[PDB]
């Protein structure tokens, strides 16, 4: 089972290093949008800033307040990282180039994005003080209210292809990406993704609690680090859901005529150049959408909790329960119900 | 057939002999429903039948709605009283 170990370590290294440099990419992208620069002093152009923030936080005290719990403030960030990471297993970087390769990959991601909420739920119970327990409630109501809207899109597109295998959903996008017939769902999925990560313009609780003496994530040491490797990974993960659902995933220009012209045989070079091209399409798509998280952060102001719950349950949900009726009708009009394969 | 019967029995006993609070009562109800579904799904596998899984999915729906209604009723009790004491209903 040696190469299985090799394949795990490659994936984990690639994902975690991508997370670490997404922090730097967030800061430098946001800076140049603000007509400044940097971090560009802690490395050769700032390529070691994230590891410096880490190593500082691992040599920092593990301090626990008097009236707090220890175990809950400790395991809850750890379980958040774990749950956020296992969603990476079902994510393909080539046709079957997946560690999981389950036939229920959509449902696995959807059940794990349901397990994610518990970090915010247990945070408020780390503070026996009374206001934090209402601030966590605000931040849970946004997530459970917006997970309905992300799911509904998973179901709308699965009406087009009747399979929960992620690779199969991507292979049906050879003909067309599902962002062309369902372009408005691209905005909706990207809005709700930004909300579920509690990112701006949906960062109500972290700001509302940064003013108050508590109701935020007042951790320190290692738990800080895990929470900031679990936010910047849930971001890539939710961006990946956008990728393999609407943007074709690993798909690109047909590389048939090129590979025919240049190779003549199926060697261990063509397989490499193929997997490079596929993953590169998947990667540049994740890059543009991570850029878009940052682009959105740089521009839009913040929402309030009333505006936000009103946005969800009174504007988005009606459009979706409408789309639930128009698309099956659109298939029934033309005799185009997809098969189970 | 074993695990379901055990969770069901222990949760009925912890529902009956709870002198402490009420959330244990809610929990024991949910665990009883879980154990039922496990009994039924084991039988549905052994028979290679579908009616068991149909009744199971139906139980999941009905149990979730049960908890919703129960936790609105509790909120009404709390509206009026302000504290849900250990031995009140």
């Amino acid at each position: 089972m040696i190469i299985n170990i090799v394949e795990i370590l490659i994936f984990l290294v690639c994902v975690l290093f991508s997370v670490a440099y997404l922090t730097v990419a967030e800061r430098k992208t946001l800076a140049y949008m603000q007509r400044r620069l940097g971090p560009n002093f802690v490395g050769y152009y700032g390529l070691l800033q994230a590891f410096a923030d880490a190593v500082k936080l691992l040599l920092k005290e593990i301090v626990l307040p008097k009236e707090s719990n220890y175990i809950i403030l400790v395991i809850s960030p750890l379980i958040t990282l774990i749950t956020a990471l296992i969603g990476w297993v079902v994510i393909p970087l080539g046709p079957g180039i997946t560690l999981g390769e389950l036939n229920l990959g959509i449902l696995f991601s959807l059940a794990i994005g349901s397990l994610g909420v518990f970090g915010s739920l247990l945070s408020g119970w780390s503070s026996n003080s009374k206001y934090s327990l209402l601030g966590s409630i605000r931040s849970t109501a946004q997530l459970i209210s917006y997970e309905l809207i992300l799911t509904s899109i998973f179901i709308i597109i699965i009406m087009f292809v009747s399979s929960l295998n992620i690779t199969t959903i991507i292979e049906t996008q050879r003909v067309v990406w599902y962002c062309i017939p369902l372009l408005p769902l691209l905005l909706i999925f990207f809005i709700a993704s930004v909300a579920e990560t509690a990112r701006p313009p949906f960062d109500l609780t972290e700001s509302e609690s940064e003013l108050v003496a508590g109701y935020f994530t007042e951790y320190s040491g290692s738990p800080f680090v895990f929470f900031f490797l679990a936010e910047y990974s849930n971001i890539i993960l939710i961006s990946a859901f956008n990728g393999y659902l609407l943007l074709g995933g690993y798909l690109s220009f047909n590389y048939s005529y090129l590979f025919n012209i240049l190779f003549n045989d199926y060697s261990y070079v063509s397989f490499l150049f193929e997997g490079l091209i596929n993953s590169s399409a998947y990667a540049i798509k994740l890059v543009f959408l991570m850029f878009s998280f940052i682009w959105v952060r740089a521009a839009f102001p913040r929402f309030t909790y009333d505006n936000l719950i009103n946005f969800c349950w009174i504007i988005l949900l009606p459009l979706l329960f409408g789309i639930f009726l128009i698309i099956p009708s659109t298939l029934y009009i033309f005799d185009s119900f997809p098969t189970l394969i | 057939m074993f695990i379901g019967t055990i969770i069901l029995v222990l949760s009925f006993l912890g529902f009956v002999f709870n002198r402490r609070n009420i959330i244990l009562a809610f929990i024991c109800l949910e665990t009883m429903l879980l154990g039922i579904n496990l009994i039924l799904l084991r039988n549905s596998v052994l028979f290679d039948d579908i009616s068991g899984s149909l009744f199971a999915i139906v139980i999941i729906i009905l149990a979730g709605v049960e908890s919703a209604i129960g936790l609105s009723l509790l909120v009404s009790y709390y509206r009026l009283r302000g504290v849900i004491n250990s031995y009140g209903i």
Binding site: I3, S18, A25, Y32, G96, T98, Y268, F271, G275, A283 | -
Partner: protein
């Protein structure tokens, strides 16, 4: 694009995931023995892969075009004895 300093970390992310996907491709291929990985396999396709494992000497995804089977095939048949469920 003007601001290369901002795009370098994107170039790190792009190149890391790129090499990760290409390397996993070669590793899956070496696991399979020179063939692209399968996906969305059902009951039938699995039962046939097991039948292939019975016809070849357990050599994974190696195929055989012979019209007639070696005499081991008649005695290599497997049934599967399952534990009672409780």
């Amino acid at each position: 694009a003007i601001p290369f300093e901002a795009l370098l970390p994107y170039g790190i992310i792009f190149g890391l995931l790129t090499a990760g996907g290409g390397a996993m491709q070669v590793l899956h291929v070496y696991r399979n023995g020179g063939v692209r990985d399968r996906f969305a396999i059902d009951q039938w396709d699995s039962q046939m892969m097991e039948r292939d494992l019975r016809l070849n000497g357990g050599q994974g995804r190696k195929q055989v075009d012979q019209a007639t089977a070696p005499e081991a095939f008649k005695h290599n048949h497997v049934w599967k004895s399952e534990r009672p469920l409780i």
